[PDB]
Amino acid sequence: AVLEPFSRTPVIPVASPDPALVNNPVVAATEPSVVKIRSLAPRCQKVLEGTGFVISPDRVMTNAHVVAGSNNVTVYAGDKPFEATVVSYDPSVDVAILAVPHLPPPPLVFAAEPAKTGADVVVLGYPGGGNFTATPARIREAIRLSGPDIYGDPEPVTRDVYTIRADVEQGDSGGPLIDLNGQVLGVVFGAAIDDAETGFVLTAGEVAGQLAKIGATQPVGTGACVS
Template sequence: MAMPADQKVADASLRSPDAMENSLMSKTRGSRRALLAMLVAALMVAGCMPVDHGGGRETRSSTVRTDEPSRDTTAAARSSVVKVRGVAPKCGAQRDRTGFVVAPHRVMTVAHGVAGAESVSVELGGTEHKAQVMSFDPSANVAILDVAELDATPLTFAESPAANGADARLLVDRDGSVAAAPVQIRETIELEGPDIYRSAIARREVYTFSGTVKSGDAGSPLIGLDGRVLGMAFGASIDDDDFGFALTAKEIASHIETAARDRPVGTGRCVS
């Protein structure tokens, strides 16, 4: 199976007023294939134009099975998924993203969702809780929040990577209700491109997956059928509305160590 040579990526909404485009090159290590991409550091949405695969390249079918396993292994995990709201008056923005509990009173989400925010909160089960940013990494696009009043069980990370073609679920908070959207892993790649500020080049290990990604899904956990975290969604193709991107568990696991910090950090400047 070959990766389309001109796939484009968005980790923010092209339909958002504060949307912006960043150019990057995504390279699949160990092969000659390269992926020309655009990162947009605001709201994440699905693609808005068809892909021209061209050249007779073979591509993995984007068909995703919608049949649920006999036992819903994601039910417990859903109660650990929250909506994250970053209010940034100086940026003229309020951004709603998704996050998930990774340690007691700690939530992981995407850094671009809280960039420049003066106040951050999370919502679980209709109740909003004040949050503080304890770690903010614009290169990895990962942030860790402290939510003192949050009582939710941390999710467990997978010990091994997902295989190509594996079924999984994207736990998304839409309209205050967490749903398990069926997705299928396409492959693992190394994605190179600018950080959320376009000030440095970052390299990330990323899953590509088949499945619909909508606005606000950035920060959603990618869950295996065993209920363990495979990664965190951060983007969607702007060339294919059935093509998403997630940082792998290996890529984001090291950030959990920062959950032990006891002092908040700054949220950086606005994404513009």
């Protein structure tokens, strides 16, 4: 008889994030390029709020689920609204790119190399659709994560992610995980259900393919409401 429990390796244990990261000079320097996204989604009977960041002039990256099902997307930078168009939308990888004419802040650069276990990193975003907040974090591990896409479609997806030790909050989706150099390590998208202090981040490598469509100008749809 082979016994039939299911087991998996735990998320890599790492030290508590350094609380002082909230005051690291990288936070204030990066903040202008981290934007709030508000999406009206009457089909879903919701207003969605999340975070994005500038990837090139007039181009903002966020998660697909931050705009899924919506019919109007506004980007806020420096407490000012900017009209946005969804020009790339990928519910499998979970990334959207927005065209945002005349958006003042400069782009952030994706980090050239992967982060290492135990590294000090920072989640930047807008919890609750409120004020900009830096959330101290620590890298646990780069993993290949398999699971459903944002719609729960039949065929699962496999993506390169970081697990992090952090308290990721609703509204942080779409924001960057930055290193202490102010470069983007990935896009924060989720939190563990059962593992309280664990967040999930799409790696820079995982989202890189989306940039092939950065030159798009026409609106693409925003798909179904997330269940």
